[PDB]
Design a protein around this ligand. Structure first.
Ligand code: W0O
Ligand code: W0O
Ligand code: MG
Lengths: 212, 211
């Protein structure tokens, strides 16, 4: 359903609420330089372990920027000199479907990072969390080359008693990855995923799974 | 490397590194659009100098990290720039606010080169270590951006000795194995997820088989 993508076309983007390209001009040890980047929000990510199912909770969705990069890789020149053309040839929508950690932007003032992660775990994963349930795994710079944003990773264990039914949050597929093949899943090069997934899986297996 | 002066922020229109695009597509039969930046793929490489029992990392000023740190502390610093040229950030932050610790890394922007060759070029240019492409082992491939970019990053690993190190801006960091995990766990040390993962991966997957 969410992997069904047709009529894909690419065009130049002028104004956008989501793209804030900027250039920093600066003198570094006397020499004048410039650097191109984008203003973006900080973010949080949360890894959930469902102990009732012995499974890590991830999310699957279509990422248009991933899709377009995959189309370019397979058909070079697809995204060339665009500055509204139909992608011919194109790829199935599954080429842009990623596996990710539950994640969201820090763009609501008055909310702690924990509260942001709880809202995203509800809205994306259908899991009811309390902010005090969350343990900070790591904080780091994401996208140091083009974005200056901090990202904070949380972890929490959940049970099926915290899982919402089908429907509920008024398109994302919730993924439950069994611990059996979790490492093999992260190591699988044919599955488009993020470093947060790869790190989250190996961190959980080496830091949490032994103590269960 | 850390002496950063006259910092000012202006609009970015062209840029070889960020190209604004919109994907138009029908998903649930419904017409949608998505704005993103076309960017380069990248490679990173984690080096383990077995002569020194140290991981090799790089320290450098990252202007985007700096600007984000100046937006924090001086909110509105990165507001929309008008037509009177760049807006001076006076006062700003010391350059150290933008200094990161990272894996050796670089852009995939030279046609004809394999990913391994890009990694070797960077390990020489940034770390002063001579590598052959056959020395590199693929650790992980992943999407480093998914939301506003769709860039792929490939992480390599190799063991080196001092025999591959050249003799006597970027700082080469040699992180002893003894304190590596505590270094990676330290939130006061501005580092990337690549460093956190690379340290954790090395200590769990490579280190136990040494000695
Ligand atoms: C000599 N040398 C050449 C490249 C010049 N250069 N590099 C970048 C840039 C862009 C993206 C990028 O992404 C990565 C790559 C690897 C790992 C993580 C992120 C890194 C650097 C750039 C920029 N954004 N704006 C202006 N000039 C920029 C600087 C001067
Ligand atoms: C209903 N809903 C509203 C937002 C709409 N929307 N979201 C994005 C967008 C931008 C950045 C972004 O960053 C993240 C966030 C979390 C984790 C990783 C990366 C995520 C989404 C967007 C876009 N770039 N262009 C056009 N429309 C876009 C879609 C439809
Ligand atoms: Mg460099």
């Amino acid at each position: 359903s969410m992997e069904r993508i047709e009529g894909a076309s690419v065009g130049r983007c002028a104004a956008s609420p989501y793209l804030r390209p900027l250039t920093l001009h600066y003198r570094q040890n006397g020499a004048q330089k410039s650097w191109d980047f984008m203003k973006t929000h900080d973010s949080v990510t949360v890894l959930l372990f469902n102990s009732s199912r012995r499974s890590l909770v991830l999310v699957k969705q279509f990422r248009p920027a991933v899709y377009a990069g995959e189309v370019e890789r397979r058909f070079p020149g697809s995204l060339a000199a665009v500055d509204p053309r139909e992608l011919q040839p194109a790829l199935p929508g599954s080429a842009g479907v990623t596996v990710e950690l539950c994640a969201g932007l820090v763009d609501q003032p008055g909310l702690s990072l924990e509260e942001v992660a709880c809202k995203e775990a509800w809205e994306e994963c259908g899991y009811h969390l309390a902010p005090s349930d969350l343990r900070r795994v790591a904080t780091y710079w994401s996208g140091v080359g083009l974005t200056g944003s901090r990202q904070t990773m949380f972890y929490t264990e959940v049970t099926d008693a915290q899982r919402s039914g089908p429907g509920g949050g008024l398109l994302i597929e919730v993924v439950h990855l069994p611990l059996e093949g979790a490492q093999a899943f992260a190591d699988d090069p044919d599955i488009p995923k993020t470093l947060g997934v790869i790190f989250g899986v190996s961190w959980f297996l080496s830091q949490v799974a032994p103590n269960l």
